[PDB]
């Protein structure tokens, strides 16, 4: 509050100097925009130059108020540069050493490793302070015991030269300046050098007390240091276990999924760096070989709907069947069915055109899936190696969403099962909850409802035409804003493969 | 509460001094078997058959002992430092016990208020950050 009324008066003076109500409101808008950390300081001062630049004094107040060669890496020294005399060199040292050729030059650590480094550095700093204090205490003790035997006449003219009879004259200076303050350290050192008789006993007493105080402080801090090390060292082993955790935390944002496809397009297909072949139609390739990975994930979903805090029973009973509906409609597995020259006959390739919501849901589906398809090729190998597992990981993942199992044990359970082969199954709950939330936002929205109805009508036809696809695109775009990014999904029944493409 | 502090302090000083003692044992551990072998050979009943052998064995024992005194005196020095430091630590410990047990005072009450401020300052260092 001491340094606020001055600013209030300065701003009142600025407002009076402006004099205009609307210009004052504009200046208020400018400073509010800066208050939201959106305007740079250089931009702020250049903007205020327009308003308060007329008053030099107020502008100054504001400005000072807001702030021959051989080898790849070796070069031959010239003849003049080869003469650096060394008296210790004998005949052998001359013959067997080189003086003509000189060499020339041509991963993110885990946060807990950084914390351990900081803790170790703090401990070593305390240890160095204590050891320097001990050495200085010993030096002062020997000086005091030497001077006490000395007579009074020699005590009166006793002068202490710099060094204090130590192997390093700078060792004790740091300790003295640490015990005292930096301003009095030089004075104390000078007094010790000039009046050792009266200075040595009292400074030695201060050192003796400070040794005990610092040791007690170190032993008090050691409680927190021990607790930090105990609770952090175990976590500080999984470099991949935490980096991929934060990657999964930052990945499933709405912008990022479309960023992947736009980036791969503009890099490989749109740019045509080769400039020799036409761009491929699609961008990403996906496969759905196994169908038993569907019932378990559906059970996980039903567990989340039966355990979620914020969902209504009429909503839950709908959600319990919506997932079955999409799986049956998309993968052909088990109006009433719906609620439960280009003409090609018996089509096997189908197209789904939709907005960001369906694309995000499908990307969540596929990101959950490729986490389980990778362990398919290693289940039997790890089953062999453990006794020298799918049901086990399934039942272990069951108990997290329903709350039976706490979050911690999930991470360590898979560690012994897979030392380095599996590092992507540690955040299943988050992706599952994201998928169920995105399914809910799919069903709730009316525009998404119309998109899903159009997809239903398109899929219900077993024969497509060239004009039918254009009609479908126009109909889906009729209720669709033009600015929204267009995507397309094609699913192949022949190979059970789903492809995607950015429009 | 001082009992806890002295319990922490005991092992550190004890271990520093024991490491020093281990170093002194290290610098002279290669002469104990030699000295014992020389003594046992001297005390053999079939040894006195040559006077020069007795003289040379006594000379060897004397040389070994002359080499062995320095380690022993350094051991006395470090053990004396051990004894005085441990005496101070035990003094603190049993004053702490006597004070804690005599009453199943305002000065030690103030230290709680002084530490309460530090605990309050450190707790608010995370809220204010």
């Amino acid at each position: 509050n001491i340094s606020l009324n001055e600013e209030v008066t300065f701003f009142e003076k600025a407002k009076r100097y402006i004099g205009n109500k609307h210009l004052y409101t504009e200046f208020l808008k400018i400073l509010n925009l800066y208050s939201q950390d959106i305007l740079d300081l250089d931009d702020l001062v250049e903007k205020v130059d327009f308003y308060l630049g007329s008053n030099k004094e107020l502008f100054t107040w504001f400005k000072n108020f807001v702030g021959e060669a051989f080898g790849p890496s070796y070069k031959r020294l010239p003849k003049s540069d080869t003469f650096m005399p060394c008296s210790g060199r004998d005949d052998m040292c001359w013959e067997v050493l080189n003086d003509e050729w000189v060499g020339h030059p041509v991963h993110r650590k885990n946060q807990y490793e950084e914390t351990l480094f900081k803790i170790e550095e703090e401990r070593h700093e305390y240890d160095f302070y204590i050891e320097s204090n001990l050495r200085t205490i010993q030096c002062l003790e020997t000086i005091v015991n030497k001077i006490e035997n000395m007579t009074e006449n020699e005590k009166a003219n006793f002068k202490l030269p710099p060094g204090l009879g130590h192997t390093s004259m700078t060792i004790y200076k740091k300790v003295i300046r640490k015990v005292y303050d930096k301003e009095r350290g030089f004075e104390i050192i000078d007094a010790l050098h000039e009046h050792p008789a009266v200075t040595a006993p009292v400074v030695l007493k201060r050192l003796k007390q400070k040794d005990e105080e610092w040791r007690r402080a170190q032993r008090e801090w050691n409680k927190v240091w021990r607790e930090l090390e105990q609770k952090v060292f175990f976590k500080s082993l999984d470099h991949l276990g935490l980096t991929f955790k934060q990657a999964d935390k930052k990945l499933l944002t709405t912008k990022q999924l479309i960023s992947e496809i736009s980036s791969i397009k503009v890099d490989q297909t749109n740019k045509k760096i080769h400039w020799l072949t036409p761009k491929p139609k699609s961008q990403l390739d996906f496969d759905f070989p196994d169908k038993n990975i569907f019932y378990d994930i559906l059970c996980l979903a039903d567990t989340f709907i039966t355990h979620t805090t914020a969902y209504s029973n009429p909503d839950k009973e709908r959600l319990k069947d919506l997932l079955k509906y999409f799986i049956s409609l998309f993968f052909s597995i088990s109006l009433l069915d719906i609620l439960h020259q280009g003409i090609i006959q018996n089509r096997s390739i189908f197209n789904l055109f939709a907005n960001t919501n369906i694309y995000i849901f499908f990307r969540h589906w596929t990101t959950i899936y490729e986490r389980l398809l990778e362990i398919k090729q290693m289940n039997e190998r790890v089953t062999k190696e453990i006794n020298t597992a799918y049901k086990q990981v399934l039942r272990l993942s069951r108990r997290l969403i329903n709350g039976d199992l706490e979050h911690q044990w999930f991470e360590e359970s898979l560690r012994q099962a897979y030392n380095n082969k599996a590092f992507k199954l540690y955040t299943i709950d988050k992706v599952t909850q994201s998928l169920v939330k995105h399914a809910h936002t799919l069903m709730t929205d009316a525009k998404t409802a119309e998109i899903m109805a159009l997809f239903v009508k398109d899929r219900n036809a077993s024969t497509t035409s060239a004009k039918d696809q254009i009609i479908y695109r126009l109909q889906v775009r009729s209720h669709m804003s033009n600015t929204e990014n267009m995507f397309r999904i094609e699913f192949d029944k022949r190979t059970l493969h789903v492809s995607i493409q950015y429009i | 509460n001082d009992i806890t502090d002295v319990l922490e302090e005991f092992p550190l000083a004890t271990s520093r001094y024991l490491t020093l003692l281990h170093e002194i044992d290290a610098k002279c551990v290669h002469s104990m078997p030699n000295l014992n072998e020389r003594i046992d050979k001297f005390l053999k009943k079939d040894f006195n058959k040559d006077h020069q052998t007795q003289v040379r064995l006594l000379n060897n024992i004397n040389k070994i002992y002359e080499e062995l005194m320095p380690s022993l005196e350094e051991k006395m020095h470090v053990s004396s430092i051990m004894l005085d430091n441990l005496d101070r630590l035990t003094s603190r410990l049993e004053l702490a016990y006597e004070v804690a047990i005599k009453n199943t005072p305002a000065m030690h009450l103030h230290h709680e208020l002084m530490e309460k401020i530090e605990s309050k300052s450190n707790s608010k260092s995370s809220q204010a950050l």
Partner: peptide, 18 residues
């Protein structure tokens, strides 16, 4: 008066003057 420092450092130099 219930201090910890800022007083003993003065008493150090105060003892020097006596």
């Amino acid at each position: 008066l219930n201090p910890l420092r800022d007083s003993e450092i003065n008493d150090d130099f105060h003892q020097w003057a006596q």
